[PDB]
Amino acid sequence: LDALLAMPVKETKVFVESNEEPLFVMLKSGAWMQQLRHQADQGDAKSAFWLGRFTVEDSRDGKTIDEGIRLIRRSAEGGFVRAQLYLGTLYANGTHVKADPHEAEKWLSRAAGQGSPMVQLYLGLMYGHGKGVPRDLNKSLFWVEKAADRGLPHAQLARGLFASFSHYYPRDDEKAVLYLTKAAKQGMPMAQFYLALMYQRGRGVEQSNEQALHWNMLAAEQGYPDAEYAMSRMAELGIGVTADKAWSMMWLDRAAHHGMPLAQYLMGMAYLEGKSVPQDLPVAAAWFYKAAMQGNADAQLRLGYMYARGIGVPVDKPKAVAWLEKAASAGNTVAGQWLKQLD
């Protein structure tokens, strides 16, 4: 069965960035109580927040939550930054109150206006989102860039990715390198990975294979899979170092064991065609399987054929078409051609 090896292999770029929008990438990461309430009703804005917050979280009664939200709002009127942020998220997510974008914007803009750079980055990421607060990409860049200039590593990465890989924010490769470097010096592997990507592709800075090797190494030493795969390509094509196919797949092995579906699929390829490692069909099918579950249509295609004819695995026609039509739905044409053959 050599028809599986005869298909042309898809050559990838040295650095493989995420296809996901950076916005959604960043947007994912007794008697004592009577004494306490008496303090809040006399002006203690801090007692009003903590009693009110722990009231709406330790109760399912509708009227108990309402009487706790009053304490949270009363503390927000007093200007407590924690109450402004807590009441602000309540209106952005519609939790326990009507989802009010104008009311959510007011408290979150106040909390960010006097709060930590984390809260400022939080408001900025939500300003270019539309849900919760009204969409405003200018106010979004302002709060994100302000939180970055204060030293927050996450906001620096966010500002760099927005001016480099976003379908929303303007493209400025020169400014992206400035903020990616600010976060890469602080130790963020993703910031070091994306900074090395810029240094190689010549976006925003002068092309330098010496520079791309430095920042991607710092990210690869930390175990960042995308950086480890970039090391597999740099070592194979002799970029920044001399060519070393053996060392190339040392990196490919790390990124595969670290969970990267692209590396796992290429590891399955490596053991399928015994060229850089001894041919091991059951191990090749196991590597295709671990990436096929993560949605890699290329691995789903290889594993489906190995099931249709029993290479490395038993002959299982149910499981064969199970992965084939799961890969054809992802746009794999040849997967549907083989699927058309199995009745």
Name the site residues for its own copies (rule: CB under 8 A): 10, 12, 16, 19-21, 30-33, 35-36, 38-39, 47, 50, 53-54, 58, 82, 167-168, 293-298, 300-301, 326-336
- Report the residue number, 242 or 333, with the smaller CB distance to its own copies: 333
> Using CA atoms, how far apart are residues 23 and 44, in angstroms rounded to an integer?
38
Residue 311 corresponds to which tokens in the numbers above?
Answer: 């290479």
**Minimal distance in Å, beta carbon 164 to its own copies?**
12
Instruction: Report the nearest approach of its own copies to the CB of residue 243 (Å).
Output: 25
Burial class (CB in 10 A: 0-12, 13-18, 19+), 281: middle
Question: Of 190 and 327, which CB lies nearer to its own copies in the complex structure?
Answer: 327
Nearer to its own copies, 216 or 300 (CB): 300
Helix ranges, the chain (H): 22-26, 31-40, 45-57, 62-77, 81-92, 101-114, 117-127, 137-149, 153-165, 173-184, 189-201, 209-221, 225-237, 245-257, 261-272, 281-292, 297-309, 317-328, 333-339
Residue closer to its own copies (CB basis): 20 or 61: 20
CB of 116 to its own copies, least distance (A): 10
Residue 31 Cβ, how far from its own copies at the closest point, in Å? Answer: 6
Do 263 and 284 touch, CB atoms closer than 8 A? no
Residue among 54 and 247 whose Cβ is closer to its own copies: 54
Query: Shortest gap between Cβ of 210 and its own copies (angstroms)?
Result: 26
Cα angle value 157/15/25 (rounded, 5°): 35
Q: Which pair of structure tokens corresponds to residue 84?
A: 């402004």
Q: Closest distance between its own copies and the C-beta of residue 19, in Å?
A: 6
Q: Which is nearer to its own copies, 150 or 214 (CB)?
A: 150
Residue 164: both structure tokens together:
């480099």
